[PDB]
Amino acid sequence: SRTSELAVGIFVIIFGIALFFLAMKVSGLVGTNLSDGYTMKAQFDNVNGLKPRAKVTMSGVTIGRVDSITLDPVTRLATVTFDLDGKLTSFNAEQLKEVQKNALDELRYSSDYTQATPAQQKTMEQQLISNMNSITSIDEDAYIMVATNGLLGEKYLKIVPGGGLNYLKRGDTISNTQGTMDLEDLISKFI
Amino acid sequence: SRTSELAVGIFVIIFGIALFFLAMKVSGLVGTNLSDGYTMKAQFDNVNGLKPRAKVTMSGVTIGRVDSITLDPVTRLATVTFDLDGKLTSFNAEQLKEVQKNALDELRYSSDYTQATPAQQKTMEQQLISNMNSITSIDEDAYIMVATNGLLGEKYLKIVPGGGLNYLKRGDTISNTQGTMDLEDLISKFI
Amino acid sequence: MNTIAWLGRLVIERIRGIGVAALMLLQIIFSLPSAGGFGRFVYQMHRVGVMSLLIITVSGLFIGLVLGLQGYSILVNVGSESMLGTMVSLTLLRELAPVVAALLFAGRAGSALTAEIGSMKQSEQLASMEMIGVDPLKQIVSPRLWAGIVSLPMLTVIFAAIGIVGGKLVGVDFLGVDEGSFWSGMQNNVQFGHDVVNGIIKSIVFALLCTWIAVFQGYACDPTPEGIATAMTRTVVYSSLCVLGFDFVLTAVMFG
Amino acid sequence: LLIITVSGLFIGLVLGLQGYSILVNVGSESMLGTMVSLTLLRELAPVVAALL
Ligand SMILES: CCCCCC/C=C/CCCCCCCCCC(=O)O[C@H](COC(=O)CCCCCCCCCCCCCCC)COP(=O)(O)OC[C@@H](O)CO
Numbered sequence A, B: 001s002r003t004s005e006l007a008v009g010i011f012v013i014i015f016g017i018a019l020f021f022l023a024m025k026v027s028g029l030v031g032t033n034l035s036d037g038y039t040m041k042a043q044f045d046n047v048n049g050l051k052p053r054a055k056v057t058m059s060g061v062t063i064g065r066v067d068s069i070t071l072d073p074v075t076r077l078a079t080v081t082f083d084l085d086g087k088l089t090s091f092n093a094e095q096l097k098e099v100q101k102n103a104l105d106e107l108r109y110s111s112d113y114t115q116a117t118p119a120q121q122k123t124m125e126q127q128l129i130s131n132m133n134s135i136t137s138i139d140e141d142a143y144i145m146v147a148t149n150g151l152l153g154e155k156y157l158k159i160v161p162g163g164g165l166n167y168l169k170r171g172d173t174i175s176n177t178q179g180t181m182d183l184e185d186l187i188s189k190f191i
Numbered sequence C: 001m002n003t004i005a006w007l008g009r010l011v012i013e014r015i016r017g018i019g020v021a022a023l024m025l026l027q028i029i030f031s032l033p034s035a036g037g038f039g040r041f042v043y044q045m046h047r048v049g050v051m052s053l054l055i056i057t058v059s060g061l062f063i064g065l066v067l068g069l070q071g072y073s074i075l076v077n078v079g080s081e082s083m084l085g086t087m088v089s090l091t092l093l094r095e096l097a098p099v100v101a102a103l104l105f106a107g108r109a110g111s112a113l114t115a116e117i118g119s120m121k122q123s124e125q126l127a128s129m130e131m132i133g134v135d136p137l138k139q140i141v142s143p144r145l146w147a148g149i150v151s152l153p154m155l156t157v158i159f160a161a162i163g164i165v166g167g168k169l170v171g172v173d174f175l176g177v178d179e180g181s182f183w184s185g186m187q188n189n190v191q192f193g194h195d196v197v198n199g200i201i202k203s204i205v206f207a208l209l210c211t212w213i214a215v216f217q218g219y220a221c222d223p224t225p226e227g228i229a230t231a232m233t234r235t236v237v238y239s240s241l242c243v244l245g246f247d248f249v250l251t252a253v254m255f256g
Numbered sequence D: 001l002l003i004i005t006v007s008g009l010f011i012g013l014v015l016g017l018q019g020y021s022i023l024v025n026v027g028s029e030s031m032l033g034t035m036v037s038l039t040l041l042r043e044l045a046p047v048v049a050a051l052l
């Protein structure tokens, strides 16, 4: 039964070490990675209460985290950089063709046929090579804002999509923001 | 004995891992280290709820801590001393020039040129050489206030910049304050 | 692989030890009662139950004093000092009184049961009783098992009662909350069937585990003066892991 | 080391399960890590580890 004592002895040591590798994974130490996360940035005027490793949502569902918050002491603005996900904000292959031909057919309508030249579909060739390389689901006129999660929640960033013909590339800067609202300024704002 | 000294050495490895996790993942210890921070002070009329080692923010970005709160019973206004920062609040080489030329331009514009005598800009160079010796980002009519994050959270100090030409030195006194607003303060406002 | 074989041989003898203790329990509870067996049970209610009454009473008072002192500091900042009696009574009745009273029962009345049965085995009173023609599982072991299943749920009710009296004494009589709001908030949110009876159902499960381990380790002991002392520290370790292990399973069913 | 490690895991499992039920009714489920860590660090980890 020496072969039996060797199997129960090995299974215990394997189970004991695999629990230790699982305990360091669910503890915020070594690991904690993300599905090809790129990086955006944005500039607010008041980020009071936003902490790093916060949460970024689009329509209630978390799409990213927050990386770092710095101040620019010449212009009184705060610059937040955050990192999104590829599986949740990037078109895989098929949707890439779908939002191509929707933005192409809406641009080449009867409104811009008379505005642009009659040598059209040449801009459709030039815009399509700029669409395929590194595009996200955040259109050009969406805006981000600092939200507060109910009434006693923590604070986080919320991307509000809207409109959109062209989109932002990976690495870009969202240029429509609005900062938070302090409750000292709320009461005052009232009267 | 060579096993028992080997096993005790593992009991000190697992203790050092857990003290590392408790200090630098659970507590705020690694996030209290200020870079060549100077020290200012302000003088309030209600600091109720403000603790030592509380937070100082400019636009939502933490730029200091709070050191000591005492009475001064000859004037009976509470005196808070707080220590700020080097990088996030003091200027540098490029920025100092970016405010030195505009501080002469905000002075010697069309409005305040013929306000002093018909002399040259050497006294308007004196307003340049009065600057670079230990300047801050805070101007002279910024005010500070004891605010509260959320509506059940802690109390911190909040610096609100506004207007202003000249800049405070390192070590001065911010001279516009307002204290805390408790429940009896909020009521007497609305009526 | 010299210690790997030793480690695998260790956990096989522990698996086989659960099989002997399972067949030992089914032989005790499935048998007919006998003559003079009620009077042996009332004698062992004195040794297990009444002897544990002084550690349980003083430890319940000290724990209720900490709960009323810590629970006032939390609730006074959110304007709910009237909920002090609700959180003191609901912390004891569903969490602390089943668990902490079972950790002091495994130490005092559990480790004394495995020393009494184990010294009967060393001095050969169990082998002398068997050769006379009396089963020692019925004469010796069976009154001691039933006296522990009855005495621990009777001792967590006394634990929870002095914990609430101790928490009322620091809250109302020293920190100065209203006495009528202490008892009225407690009579409103605490139910009898969901909070009081569910704490007794926990302590019956714990009393079966703490006594079946303590009785088995003295019977299947090693009749040698440091084989008894090795067994007494096995009933404190195995009972504490079973109390904390079955506590997570019972709260996920009752209050989840 | 083996009784202390397994008993600490079982107690933290009950604290996170009971503390979620209290905090979710007052809209403060984000304070779960504060009440779990502050219950252990000042009350339960000095006392229960000294009873074992
Ligand atoms: C949303 C719903 C809200 C709840 C509504 C309930 C309202 C409150 C009223 C009454 C309280 C009911 C709560 C469930 C009661 C738990 C029952 C239980 O936990 O059963 C225990 C099993 O324990 C063990 O094995 C440890 C094994 C544990 C696993 C057992 C799995 C239990 C599954 C059946 C229980 C049905 C639960 C009904 C509640 C919805 C047995 O307890 P005892 O009788 O002492 O047996 C003595 C032991 O020595 C066995 O010999």
Ligand SMILES: CCCCCC/C=C\CCCCCCCCCC(=O)O[C@H](COC(=O)CCCCCCCCCCCCCCC)COP(=O)(O)OC[C@@H](O)CO
Binding pocket: A012, A015, A020, A023, A024, A027, B001, B003, B004, B007, B014, B017, B018, B021, C010, C011, D001, D002, D005
């Ligand atoms: C960031 C978070 C921080 C957290 C840090 C990580 C926390 C610590 C992690 C892990 C700690 C694991 C504990 C290791 C225990 C080491 C014990 C030990 O190492 O002790 C050994 C024996 O252990 C023995 O009994 C063998 C002991 C019993 C064996 C266990 C058998 C139960 C397991 C099998 C069942 C599987 C479990 C069921 C799961 C479904 C020593 O042998 P001895 O012959 O007695 O002495 C020999 C001396 O004379 C000279 O050497």
Ligand SMILES: CCCCCC/C=C\CCCCCCCCCC(=O)O[C@H](COC(=O)CCCCCCCCCCCCCCC)COP(=O)(O)OC[C@@H](O)CO
Binding pocket: C028, C029, C030, C031, C032, C033, C034, C035, C036, C037, C038, C040, C041, C134, C135, C138, C139, C140, C142, C143, C146, C150
């Ligand atoms: C749901 C069904 C019931 C729940 C139980 C479920 C568990 C399975 C069934 C258990 C009952 C089966 C009946 C058989 C019991 C077998 C144990 C037994 O029969 O033990 C007997 C002891 O008496 C004894 O009942 C010990 C004497 C009585 C012990 C209990 C006393 C009850 C008093 C408290 C009851 C609490 C009620 C209070 C409510 C508020 C006999 O021991 P001895 O006389 O010393 O032997 C010695 C000779 O043989 C040789 O010297």
Ligand SMILES: CCCCCC/C=C\CCCCCCCCCC(=O)O[C@H](COC(=O)CCCCCCCCCCCCCCC)COP(=O)(O)OC[C@@H](O)CO
Binding pocket: C050, C051, C053, C054, C057, C158, C161, C162, C165
């Ligand atoms: C509404 C709220 C509900 C609450 C209900 C009320 C709760 C219960 C209330 C009170 C319970 C009190 C506990 C009583 C303990 C009884 C113990 C007992 O009665 O046991 C006795 C011994 O106790 C012994 O050791 C003597 C035991 C030690 C003596 C104690 C010494 C410490 C005290 C002295 C120091 C003072 C304290 C310091 C204060 C400043 C028995 O003697 P034995 O020789 O061993 O056995 C003899 C047998 O063979 C035959 O008789």
